[PDB]
Scaffold this active site. Structure first.
Site, short mmCIF file in Angstrom:
data_model
loop_
_atom_site.label_atom_id
_atom_site.label_comp_id
_atom_site.label_asym_id
_atom_site.label_seq_id
_atom_site.Cartn_x
_atom_site.Cartn_y
_atom_site.Cartn_z
N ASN A 195 0.49 -1.34 -0.19
CA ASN A 195 -0.09 -0.07 0.24
C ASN A 195 0.78 1.28 -0.01
O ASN A 195 0.02 2.53 -0.23
CB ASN A 195 -1.03 -0.15 1.17
CG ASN A 195 -1.96 -1.14 0.90
OD1 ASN A 195 -2.27 -1.61 -0.44
ND2 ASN A 195 -2.86 -1.62 1.79
N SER A 220 -4.11 -0.14 -56.43
CA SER A 220 -3.92 -0.85 -57.79
C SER A 220 -3.74 0.05 -58.85
O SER A 220 -4.20 1.32 -58.84
CB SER A 220 -5.41 -1.36 -57.87
OG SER A 220 -5.75 -1.77 -59.26
#
Ligand SMILES: [Cl-]
Ligand SMILES: [Cl-]
Ligand SMILES: [Cl-]
Ligand SMILES: [Cl-]
Lengths: 444, 430, 430, 444
Positions: free
Chosen positions: C141, C307
């Protein structure tokens, strides 16, 4: 009805109405929520103040004639002072990026100004909603300026409420300084602390938002008014009229779509909501019971109960706060989405944004005020129940380590858990000195 | 050190010689290094892509005269990927831009090169097996990817269902174990009326049972795919082949222009995961609350200890399994918001953000299945009731005065018990 | 081969070679949820090792830790600080226990590496004990929340550099396009002319604001609760020397114990940058739309192939990847909000989830901005002619004619231009 | 004023108020939003129906005397018929999990029942808000039942709006069937589609929501009312409301389940997501008039400027986007409320029902306004649509069988560089156009 005309055509307007044709159209175009602009009156007053600034800037710059300047300034003063609020009728969800709110101002201000000149409604040949009231102005610098001003005008209610709740938590921290109790981590019994420290921690986390709230709100001071000479002038007048110090933005192309300050400010409302919800959750859990929960504090009973169920206290004020907090977190997502959806040179969704932020400011302001006044101020400690928790602390065995060693201390801890006794009781029964435990149980 | 030289429409690049991916995947690796989380971290999507490629290759072999030698090499390569091989060759970041193109292309190149290998040809011999012309024949990203996304989600359903059933069973059995365990109900955290801990645990089961059917019904929306929308005979056949390969009956969308941008099923499914997370987190919260203590909390149940505690702090049991469940649920809720934003951001004939969507939903599915599994196996199955502490809560109930009504005056016994600190059984004798 | 190890729960077999122990192995089985391990957030592992070094030094300087064990521990810490042994940090990021398993994962790895340095086998915990020695004077803690904050501090530079890189990129384009006239658009409608350069400078300007804010909010992480007195004050001083950051002890341990305010504020600044970044990326995708039937005002560098038969098609993949990162960071912000809101009394149990989300969001955003700058903004080109034409076809230009020919006449010229395709200068020249 | 008393003490109540002391305390405890229960009248009417159902079952089971039953029922009928809305004053953000809504109804009904008996307000010994109006009831069965009923009573308005908008989009899909235009994927010019197909896709996606909305709303039909009396109350409530209800099987699960509110809020969210996307598309397709896409024209519903003709701000879609962001934000608010349930109750259904009814109203009106004031009057720019399709580079692909792939690509690149169409380039090299004009044919 009187009959009015704009570029789309003709309509019949109630003679009783100070709004005109463009507002009437907006009412039928964006009827969506039954929430009108008057439910966000800070924006209305801001709109009237910008209009005053602009009339003055036009007047001093010879652009606007002197009988016009003076009738319109009067009209704006009327609204600034809270008249004609019911004439602000456009839905908060209006499309048009603020145009419908700009027009609702322009038209109401025009009509009111005519009525100062002893002239009838719709006489736009004398005072024109566009030509006069809107002179040298467009929606895209007026509305964003009025949004920022509305938020600046609304800061004080949030600050006052935050300070009030901080003070309330601070007082209880002092009142409970001597009240020992058990700390809980992961909801498992941990080490003793005081209830006062717990309440002071509620105060301290919130104290962190006061200065931050102010400093992020200051970002709104940077405005794009006159962004279409006249600009520097209008900004000066708007500062005196509003009572808030404003400044021109350094970059106009940047400002045109910038919603960054809105996102930051909403994010601090969200941050305050997260803290406030966690604190409310703690209060509900600490007051659980009255016999089979934690029973560590009692909240003031503000709603009546049943004679046959005494001791039941539903923690309704914290519950209302939780609700406001969830709403504020959802409204922040709403603002994020609108902000992310800007396109090129404008964000079209400032009406949505300003409605969510002003709403969240109202909700949080009121929730904090209620939380302090109707809950925190009257909280009482169940001193004996708090003490019992701390004295039953298995962690007390650790204070035996110096004296008896780790293993023996752990064995005393195990025996206390098993037998239901305090560590102090088990230590005594062994012929041991439990003085170190007394020190762990000392608030001072 | 050796490399081979490849070409695409942007130019030529040197590719590490043994890599099964090619130039376009290499570019995607350079372009989208964002999270250090690659496609192989969501292998369901990799397997689904390979299933689609195989379906397409089969349909091309049947209807479009893809040569048998290419067909069989390509199908052998898809089978390998379907079966878990070459996962490390799926290296494009899950945050990739391109709406799925780079995922399509990572599959095209790897399958081409693995097919080549099955034909005893070298990597890069694309005149023999071409990533675009052969492996991507009759396909584009815009039908391959959303179809593979839908399939991956369908193939991942069973892991969530199994876990949900496992957690439900776990809760049902503790509901039986705890049937005689009386305790105090709590409303708004105030002591209310007695209930049993059995009923409490059965209610955890009951709410989850509602989710099993809704999960299957929403998941079934994923069966409608737009595969072959690029290229109607081919389309129909590719879907028949994909249903056969996957073992799941799929169907053609009736409306391709609608299907083009549509993310409705994703949002609905993300929504059910979110709903499951909300319930599970509430249940985890209850478990953490009921096991608070052991002395100064509720102390009604004990969770099995799965990590060692401190010898000096006996009795302390941090509820680490429920806590890990809470964290998973908050992650799923946040991920659902990510999905909502991606979904809302589609434009015209495409949503560009399906890589992000499929990544979040698969992650949330894995997170939830495992959280429910761990909760059932490492926590629920070993839960103990502290029976006498439960009993004392119920016997301390002020609500018990209400029973006494045949003796108003009951309200005075309730008042006396509250202040005296005694039970309403104790006050009523006197 | 396996070695045998023992803790308070019993015995387990551990892979002989592993630097982790039984506690970590238990955590692997308990919290196996995401397939994402502590090693995926190495800033936390390094920060843990710093905190372990500082504690060993404090302990040594206060006569609690023997010289040979201190020296072997510090050397083991330094090794991990360098990045060695990352693979031994195997605990899931969604771990329950509020950081305990992370603390233990460190303790065991450091014990075994220090044992190696002293020429001892794994598991010789008699010589170096993971709890008694490496975790001496320490608890989860204090250690874990300290290490969380430090990890966040050491991770600042990456986001700051990314942000500066991106601002620089936009600033450069702001100057280059300084004379590229184009049409402004408000609500997506043609408005008044602006320059493309101004558009890009504005992107820079809005991000410049976030830089100082990021540093300001990051300073809050310097307040740590480490060692919560001789030990505490020494540990922080050592940690400040080790980390090179000036750290200060918190003045309110009870407040610090559950406070997540700084995490929420930090996450909120990441969310704001994401909101802005996403809007900018959306702008870039819109401005480069087309090339013929979109806005066509700019061209993004082509970075992913097309393309050759579809030239002019440039999918805006870099901004798309950026939008995806932004949506994820916004969702992750909601995750942090839920975790922060769910703190209870003297602890927030959910810091492991918070630190994982914040560290991931920082890495994603830093990479997103670096990529946006280097692989997109730097190469952006203006379509000067298409830009000018939009500015030339602006009906708003008719407004400049009001003083020349008066309202009515200017407005009929405006009207004539609309209903006839021609520009305002064309119609006025007639 | 008149003086009333509850278990906490006494208050003065304005003499004309139908509400009592418990409501007055609630107004003080929870003034947060300035939004009262009367802003969600469906919950008011549901509560009145539940109270009518309970009085009737109590009467038929001989637990409630005839004159009290008759008067209570008459009073509930008045509220179901739309009277006394202004008496429902408790804030929507009320804590108490519904208690203050229950008590607001009990008090108003008791007083109105007194008026039917010719008795003064406050005569609670004749008609008591708790003993008589709340007989056999508690907040925790009455409130969540009324919440479910309110959402059921509000379904029709959302279904009607959804069907209206679907029908508007369908008609435009038919109208635009022969309008070819260029598809756009990732904002890049793709392949030609029709504008008609695009509008039919808007309809088709929303059609999937109609059935699912109903099936999810069906989940609210399961209620915990009474948990002999209970079965009878549900039979009555079904009859009174005209909606068939059934008792839930598990009362311990039902006590906290918010599963259905989360699923329902999720469908509202899903609808908002689709609708915002669609509105985004409308705003993009109508951008211009000259330097945008300029493919469709939205009806001009907001007045323009004579010297800016052609400017048409897309104000209706913009209001729709704003509503959609609000709904998404509200959905997060619901998720947090739902996740924050504890043990045997979720304390936050007041917040849930408010967000969900507000979201239902917002969406229903948004969709109605989009259909009527925008979509019905949309027109295609047929020529500009066709030009976009004709300039599509994808057209080069139709030439591959004539000139081969390579030469097809050289023409594509040349088209792009010259700005010419692929047909223009094709013809310029003496090649047949035939193949191309087939891919530009709306019949496919
Ligand atoms: Cl306001
Ligand atoms: Cl996967
Ligand atoms: Cl990291
Ligand atoms: Cl309503």
């Amino acid at each position: 009805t009187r009959r009015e005309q704009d570029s789309l055509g003709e309509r019949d307007i109630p003679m009783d109405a100070y709004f005109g044709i463009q507002t009437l159209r907006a009412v039928e175009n964006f009827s969506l929520s039954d929430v009108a602009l008057n439910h966000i009156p800070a924006l209305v007053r801001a709109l009237a103040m910008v209009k005053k600034a602009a009339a003055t800037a036009n007047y001093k710059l010879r652009q606007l004639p002197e009988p016009k300047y003076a009738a319109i300034v009067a009209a704006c003063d009327d609204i600034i002072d809270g008249l004609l609020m019911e004439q602000f009728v456009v839905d908060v969800f209006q499309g048009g990026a603020g145009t419908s709110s700009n027009m609702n101002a322009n038209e109401v201000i025009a009509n009111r100004a005519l009525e100062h000149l002893g002239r009838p409604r719709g006489d736009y040949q004398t005072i024109h909603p566009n030509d006069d009231v809107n002179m040298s102005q467009s929606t895209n610098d007026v509305y964003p300026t009025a949004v920022r001003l509305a938020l600046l005008l609304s800061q004080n209610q949030v600050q006052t409420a935050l300070h009030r709740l901080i003070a309330a938590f601070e007082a209880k921290g002092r009142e409970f300084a001597t009240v020992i109790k058990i700390g809980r981590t992961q909801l498992q019994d941990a080490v003793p602390i005081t209830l006062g420290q717990e309440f002071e921690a509620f105060a301290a986390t919130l104290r962190e938002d006061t200065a931050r709230l102010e400093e992020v709100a200051a970002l709104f001071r940077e405005v794009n008014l006159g962004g279409t000479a006249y600009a520097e002038q209008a900004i000066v007048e708007l500062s005196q009229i509003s009572g808030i110090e404003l400044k021109a933005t350094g970059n106009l192309v940047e400002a045109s779509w910038d919603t960054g300050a809105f996102v930051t400010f909403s994010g601090i409302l969200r941050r305050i909501a997260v803290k406030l919800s966690k604190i409310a959750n703690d209060l509900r859990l600490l007051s659980s019971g009255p016999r089979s929960g934690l029973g560590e504090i009692r909240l003031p009973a503000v709603q009546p109960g049943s004679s046959i169920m005494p001791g039941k206290v539903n923690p309704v004020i914290p519950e209302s706060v939780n609700q406001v907090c969830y709403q504020v977190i959802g409204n922040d997502l709403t603002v994020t989405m609108a902000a992310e959806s800007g396109q090129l040179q404008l964000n079209a969704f400032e009406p949505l944004i300003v409605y969510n932020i002003l709403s969240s400011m109202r909700l949080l302001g009121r929730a904090m005020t209620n939380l302090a006044e109707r809950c925190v101020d009257g909280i009482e400690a169940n001193v004996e129940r708090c003490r019992a928790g701390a004295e039953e602390s298995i962690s007390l065995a650790t204070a035996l380590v110096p004296v008896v060693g780790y293993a023996r201390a752990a064995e005393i801890a195990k025996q206390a858990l098993a037998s239901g006794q305090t560590v102090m009781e088990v230590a005594i029964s062994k012929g041991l000195d439990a003085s170190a435990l007394t020190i762990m149980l000392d608030p001072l």
